[PDB]
Each structure stands twice: as structure tokens, then as C-alpha cells.
Motif scaffolding. Structure first.
Motif, PDB file in Angstrom:
ATOM      1  N   UNK A 184      19.351  -6.890 -22.443  1.00 36.63           N
ATOM      2  CA  UNK A 184      20.163  -6.380 -21.332  1.00 36.63           C
ATOM      3  C   UNK A 184      20.218  -4.854 -21.291  1.00 36.63           C
ATOM      4  N   UNK A 185      19.797  -4.148 -22.329  1.00 36.61           N
ATOM      5  CA  UNK A 185      19.734  -2.692 -22.332  1.00 36.61           C
ATOM      6  C   UNK A 185      18.344  -2.178 -22.624  1.00 36.61           C
ATOM      7  N   UNK A 186      18.265  -0.906 -22.940  1.00 37.94           N
ATOM      8  CA  UNK A 186      17.002  -0.274 -23.313  1.00 37.94           C
ATOM      9  C   UNK A 186      16.677  -0.601 -24.751  1.00 37.94           C
ATOM     10  N   UNK A 187      15.477  -1.066 -25.033  1.00 35.44           N
ATOM     11  CA  UNK A 187      15.072  -1.518 -26.330  1.00 35.44           C
ATOM     12  C   UNK A 187      13.902  -0.676 -26.827  1.00 35.44           C
ATOM     13  N   UNK A 188      13.952  -0.097 -28.012  1.00 32.40           N
ATOM     14  CA  UNK A 188      12.793   0.660 -28.501  1.00 32.40           C
ATOM     15  C   UNK A 188      11.660  -0.308 -28.848  1.00 32.40           C
ATOM     16  N   UNK A 189      10.447   0.189 -28.663  1.00 33.42           N
ATOM     17  CA  UNK A 189       9.241  -0.583 -28.887  1.00 33.42           C
ATOM     18  C   UNK A 189       8.306   0.186 -29.822  1.00 33.42           C
ATOM     19  N   UNK A 190       7.714  -0.583 -30.758  1.00 35.21           N
ATOM     20  CA  UNK A 190       6.635  -0.068 -31.607  1.00 35.21           C
ATOM     21  C   UNK A 190       5.432  -0.988 -31.436  1.00 35.21           C
ATOM     22  N   UNK A 191       4.241  -0.389 -31.379  1.00 38.30           N
ATOM     23  CA  UNK A 191       2.998  -1.148 -31.236  1.00 38.30           C
ATOM     24  C   UNK A 191       2.030  -0.633 -32.311  1.00 38.30           C
ATOM     25  N   UNK A 192       1.422  -1.560 -33.029  1.00 36.32           N
ATOM     26  CA  UNK A 192       0.441  -1.195 -34.029  1.00 36.32           C
ATOM     27  C   UNK A 192      -0.755  -2.127 -33.874  1.00 36.32           C
ATOM     28  N   UNK A 193      -1.945  -1.536 -33.716  1.00 36.07           N
ATOM     29  CA  UNK A 193      -3.189  -2.287 -33.521  1.00 36.07           C
ATOM     30  C   UNK A 193      -4.243  -1.842 -34.524  1.00 36.07           C
ATOM     31  N   UNK A 194      -4.925  -2.810 -35.099  1.00 36.16           N
ATOM     32  CA  UNK A 194      -6.168  -2.585 -35.831  1.00 36.16           C
ATOM     33  C   UNK A 194      -7.270  -3.291 -35.079  1.00 36.16           C
ATOM     34  N   UNK A 195      -8.369  -2.580 -34.835  1.00 35.70           N
ATOM     35  CA  UNK A 195      -9.457  -3.062 -34.040  1.00 35.70           C
ATOM     36  C   UNK A 195     -10.801  -2.899 -34.712  1.00 35.70           C
ATOM     37  N   UNK A 196     -11.740  -3.738 -34.313  1.00 29.09           N
ATOM     38  CA  UNK A 196     -13.129  -3.679 -34.739  1.00 29.09           C
ATOM     39  C   UNK A 196     -13.924  -4.181 -33.501  1.00 29.09           C
ATOM     40  N   UNK A 197     -14.633  -3.262 -32.849  1.00 28.32           N
ATOM     41  CA  UNK A 197     -15.470  -3.636 -31.699  1.00 28.32           C
ATOM     42  C   UNK A 197     -16.918  -3.291 -32.036  1.00 28.32           C
ATOM     43  N   UNK A 198     -17.765  -4.303 -32.145  1.00 26.56           N
ATOM     44  CA  UNK A 198     -19.151  -4.148 -32.538  1.00 26.56           C
ATOM     45  C   UNK A 198     -19.248  -3.316 -33.816  1.00 26.56           C
ATOM     46  N   UNK A 199     -18.356  -3.480 -34.760  1.00 27.40           N
ATOM     47  CA  UNK A 199     -18.360  -2.772 -36.029  1.00 27.40           C
ATOM     48  C   UNK A 199     -17.693  -1.419 -35.996  1.00 27.40           C
ATOM     49  N   UNK A 200     -17.291  -0.932 -34.826  1.00 24.96           N
ATOM     50  CA  UNK A 200     -16.556   0.320 -34.663  1.00 24.96           C
ATOM     51  C   UNK A 200     -15.117   0.010 -34.995  1.00 24.96           C
ATOM     52  N   UNK A 201     -14.598   0.431 -36.139  1.00 25.72           N
ATOM     53  CA  UNK A 201     -13.219   0.175 -36.558  1.00 25.72           C
ATOM     54  C   UNK A 201     -12.329   1.285 -36.106  1.00 25.72           C
ATOM     55  N   UNK A 202     -11.111   0.924 -35.689  1.00 26.81           N
ATOM     56  CA  UNK A 202     -10.157   1.909 -35.180  1.00 26.81           C
ATOM     57  C   UNK A 202      -8.760   1.358 -35.257  1.00 26.81           C
ATOM     58  N   UNK A 203      -7.697   2.137 -35.209  1.00 30.71           N
ATOM     59  CA  UNK A 203      -6.323   1.845 -35.137  1.00 30.71           C
ATOM     60  C   UNK A 203      -5.655   2.671 -34.040  1.00 30.71           C
ATOM     61  N   UNK A 204      -4.649   2.026 -33.479  1.00 30.33           N
ATOM     62  CA  UNK A 204      -3.791   2.608 -32.453  1.00 30.33           C
ATOM     63  C   UNK A 204      -2.320   2.382 -32.808  1.00 30.33           C
ATOM     64  N   UNK A 205      -1.520   3.430 -32.658  1.00 31.78           N
ATOM     65  CA  UNK A 205      -0.081   3.344 -32.810  1.00 31.78           C
ATOM     66  C   UNK A 205       0.604   3.734 -31.501  1.00 31.78           C
ATOM     67  N   UNK A 206       1.610   2.969 -31.103  1.00 30.27           N
ATOM     68  CA  UNK A 206       2.341   3.253 -29.919  1.00 30.27           C
ATOM     69  C   UNK A 206       3.822   3.234 -30.124  1.00 30.27           C
ATOM     70  N   UNK A 207       4.526   3.989 -29.288  1.00 28.17           N
ATOM     71  CA  UNK A 207       5.967   4.055 -29.253  1.00 28.17           C
ATOM     72  C   UNK A 207       6.438   4.128 -27.829  1.00 28.17           C
ATOM     73  N   UNK A 208       7.622   3.575 -27.578  1.00 33.58           N
ATOM     74  CA  UNK A 208       8.263   3.769 -26.283  1.00 33.58           C
ATOM     75  C   UNK A 208       9.491   2.882 -26.185  1.00 33.58           C
ATOM     76  N   UNK A 209       9.773   2.462 -24.965  1.00 34.02           N
ATOM     77  CA  UNK A 209      10.983   1.659 -24.754  1.00 34.02           C
ATOM     78  C   UNK A 209      10.781   0.773 -23.535  1.00 34.02           C
ATOM     79  N   UNK A 210      11.572  -0.280 -23.504  1.00 37.56           N
ATOM     80  CA  UNK A 210      11.517  -1.211 -22.396  1.00 37.56           C
ATOM     81  C   UNK A 210      12.915  -1.515 -21.917  1.00 37.56           C
TER      82      UNK A 210
END
Ligand code: MG
Lengths: 64, 165
Positions: free
Chosen positions: A8-34
Motif C-alpha cells: 500500500x506504500x512505497x517499497x524499496x527494491x533490489x535487483x541482482x542478476x548473474x548472466x551468461x550469454x554465449x559464454x559472455x559472463x556478466x552481473x547487473x545490480x539494480x536499486x529503486x522503488x515501487x
């Protein structure tokens, strides 16, 4: 549902991704609110491993 | 697309909101994203509360991409088209399935289709809402932080459930 009283209010959000696309490894971190009352999400993502090996738009449905 | 618990469900449709109903224990969200004439992503995510924070943890695996296709060749515009996410119940798993199409704009004016197939299942043992068919209407805006020099994306999204009277 009981779970919805959690949104019912504003909620903080964290996003964490680990990826591997055709052997290309990477990570993404996100922050925000909903704010589900308004269906509204604001997020900023950073590739923490350097350059993202795929276009950012292709990750929106996964990260957003 | 990752935290569909933030969708606005109209009051008259709130009994169809699986995503919030699984909270705080959360849900597993899995997808296959099939890029037409190119490779695919398989994703597995756990979406749950950690304290008062909603956390989305994701593992993504992509295979069969073309070296000079639109993905690995970085030929997609930095923008995003509105779309609908079509949801149905999956009673056999006490969760939901979804299907939808993303059209990514290619820099030559064409479009790169990304077919999405989705399954969500609850992590916890509390009751969850199994919905009638409906969809989420989604609009997304991508931007850059002008003071950010790391590779990054800023996303503003609005999501509203619809399709039931
Ligand atoms: Mg019914």
C-alpha cells in the motif's frame, strides 16, 4: 490477499542478476522503488562487471 | 517484468493478483525468451521480501546467439514499446503462466521479436490467488543518468492489470 497490505506504500527494491550469454559472463545490480497503488516502478541498473554484452532493452522484462 | 507484484490491480480485480498473494515468502519466476531468428534466454528468479525490501534475484543463461545478429551485434535501439502480458492460472502448480511478445526496435527501422513464455510458482505455504485470465498493460521508458559513466539503464515503468469487467 494479506500479501497485498505489504504494497500500500512505497517499497524499496533490489535487483541482482548473474548472466551468461554465449559464454559472455556478466552481473547487473539494480536499486529503486515501487508504488503498486499507481502501478509505478523506478529502477536504475548498473553492469558491475564492465560493459554489458547484450543490449539493455533485452533485459528489461527480466530486471524491471 | 521482473517484479510484477508492483502491478496496479483495480479493486474489482484484486482477487486475481497472484503476485502479491505470494508475499512475503515470494515466488519463483521462470522464463524462456526466444529471439526470432536468433538465440534464447532462460531465466530463473526468486522474488521475495528481505525485511521491508522487495528483492529480485535472477540467473540468466543465453545460448545460440548469432555473433552478428541484433543482440550480440548491438543493433537494438535504446527504447521500448508498450505491451500486454497475458496471464492464465496453472492450478497443477498453484501458480500462473504468462505469454507475451516484445518487439525490440532495430536501428534500421525493423523489429526484433522476443517471444516470452513465463511460469511462476509460490515459495511459501500460505494460500495464493489463482487468477482468471487477464493481462497486464505495460509501458516502459528507458533513459540514462547523465552523470553516470558506468554501463547502466534507468527504467520507469507503469503496469496495470486489465481484462476483467
Ligand atoms: Mg473466477
Amino acid at each position: 490477499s494479506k500479501g497485498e497490505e505489504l504494497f500500500t506504500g512505497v517499497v524499496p527494491i533490489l535487483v541482482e542478476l548473474d548472466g551468461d550469454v554465449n559464454g559472455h559472463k556478466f552481473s547487473v545490480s539494480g536499486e529503486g522503488e515501487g508504488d503498486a497503488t499507481y502501478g509505478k516502478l523506478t529502477l536504475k541498473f548498473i553492469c558491475t562487471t564492465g560493459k554489458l554484452p547484450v543490449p539493455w532493452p533485452t533485459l528489461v522484462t527480466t530486471l524491471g | 517484468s521482473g517484479v510484477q507484484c508492483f502491478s496496479r490491480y483495480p479493486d474489482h480485480m484484486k482477487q486475481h493478483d497472484f503476485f502479491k498473494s505470494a508475499m512475503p515468502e515470494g515466488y519463483v519466476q521462470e522464463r524462456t525468451i526466444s529471439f526470432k531468428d536468433d538465440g534464447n534466454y532462460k531465466t530463473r528468479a526468486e522474488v521475495k521480501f528481505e525485511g521491508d525490501t522487495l528483492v529480485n534475484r535472477i540467473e540468466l543463461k543465453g545460448i545460440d546467439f548469432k555473433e552478428d545478429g541484433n543482440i550480440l551485434g548491438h543493433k537494438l535501439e535504446y527504447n521500448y514499446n508498450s505491451h500486454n502480458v497475458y496471464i492464465t492460472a496453472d492450478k497443477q502448480k498453484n501458480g500462473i503462466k504468462a505469454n507475451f511478445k516484445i518487439r525490440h526496435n532495430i536501428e534500421d527501422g525493423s523489429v526484433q521479436l522476443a517471444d516470452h513464455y513465463q511460469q511462476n510458482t509460490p515459495i511459501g505455504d500460505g494460500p495464493v490467488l489463482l487468477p482468471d485470465n487477464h493481462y497486464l498493460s505495460t509501458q516502459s521508458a528507458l533513459s540514462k543518468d547523465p552523470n553516470e559513466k558506468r554501463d547502466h539503464m534507468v527504467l520507469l515503468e507503469f503496469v496495470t492489470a486489465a481484462g476483467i469487467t
